[PDB]
Amino acid sequence: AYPTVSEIPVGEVRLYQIADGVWSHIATQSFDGAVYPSNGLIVRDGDELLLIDTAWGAKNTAALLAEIEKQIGLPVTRAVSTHFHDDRVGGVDVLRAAGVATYASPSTRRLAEVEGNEIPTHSLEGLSSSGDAVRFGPVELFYPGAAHSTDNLVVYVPSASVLYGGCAIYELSRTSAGNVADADLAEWPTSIERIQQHYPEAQFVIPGHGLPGGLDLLKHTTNVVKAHTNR
Ligand SMILES: C[C@H](CS)C(=O)N[C@H](Cc1c[nH]c2ccccc12)C(=O)O
Ligand SMILES: [Zn+2]
Ligand SMILES: [Zn+2]
Numbered sequence: 001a002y003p004t005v006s007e008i009p010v011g012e013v014r015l016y017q018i019a020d021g022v023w024s025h026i027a028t029q030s031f032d033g034a035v036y037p038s039n040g041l042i043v044r045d046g047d048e049l050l051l052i053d054t055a056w057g058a059k060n061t062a063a064l065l066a067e068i069e070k071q072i073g074l075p076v077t078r079a080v081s082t083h084f085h086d087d088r089v090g091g092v093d094v095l096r097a098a099g100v101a102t103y104a105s106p107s108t109r110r111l112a113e114v115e116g117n118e119i120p121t122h123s124l125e126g127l128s129s130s131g132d133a134v135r136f137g138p139v140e141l142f143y144p145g146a147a148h149s150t151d152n153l154v155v156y157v158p159s160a161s162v163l164y165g166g167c168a169i170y171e172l173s174r175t176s177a178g179n180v181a182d183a184d185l186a187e188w189p190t191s192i193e194r195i196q197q198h199y200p201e202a203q204f205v206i207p208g209h210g211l212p213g214g215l216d217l218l219k220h221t222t223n224v225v226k227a228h229t230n231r
């Protein structure tokens with residue numbers, strides 16, 4: 001039932017309902033010769049919507065906004081990017097031109113600028129130390145420490161028991177490390193343990209790329225990271 005790369009041509013976006021008022025968005029992109037899928041989140045906020053992450057590029061993110069209007073029909077008023085890579089901020093300029101207020105931590109905004117990537121407009125306070133959490137509309141934002149990147153955030157929806165891990169959490173079918181160029185391999189297992197301690201009641205866990213599952217995805221990611229460390 002969850003859509004895969006074989007079903008989404010590059011340039012198209014699908015939506016998947018996880019629980020009442022909570023969807024994932026799924027898109028695809030070419031990277032150095034191959035095609036990969038990528039997930040973000042949509043959370044209903046009264047009569048408005050909060051978006052978590054772009055759809056990995058300008059064309060994909062325009063298609064995302066069109067699909068949201070067709071299928072859900074409520075305005076996207078705010079967006080949060082969970083780290084500085086192009087699958088999270090690529091498309092921020094399209095969001096801004098459409099009137100969406102874009103947000104990220106000051107750490108993410110700095111790293112995006114250094115990389116020459118698109119830069120969310122607004123800065124999120126209260127997330128500078130490992131273990132920090134803040135409320136943002138219908139979600140909680142949590143900084144677990146450095147992992148896939150030094151700035152990575154995770155997102156929890158308390159009304160639905162949905163944990164969105166972004167690219168700090170791997171899907172079960174991935175048994176080898178992927179893009180680790182910006183990672184803190186030494187701290188990644190400790191950061192995962194902070195997530196487990198803060199969200200033990202999570203029922204649905206969504207990785208940055210691929211299939212959702214349960215809390216087992218956390219220990220799975222620690223196993224993959226430690227195996228890579230011992231390469
Ligand atoms: C451009 C993005 C930024 S996080 C990126 O590099 N993403 C890769 C995605 C990836 C690498 N190997 C795979 C195998 C199966 C499914 C996904 C992948 C990552 O997060 O490691
Ligand atoms: Zn990344
Ligand atoms: Zn990613």
Ligand SMILES: [Zn+2]
Binds near residue numbers: 172219220221223
């Ligand atoms: Zn495993």
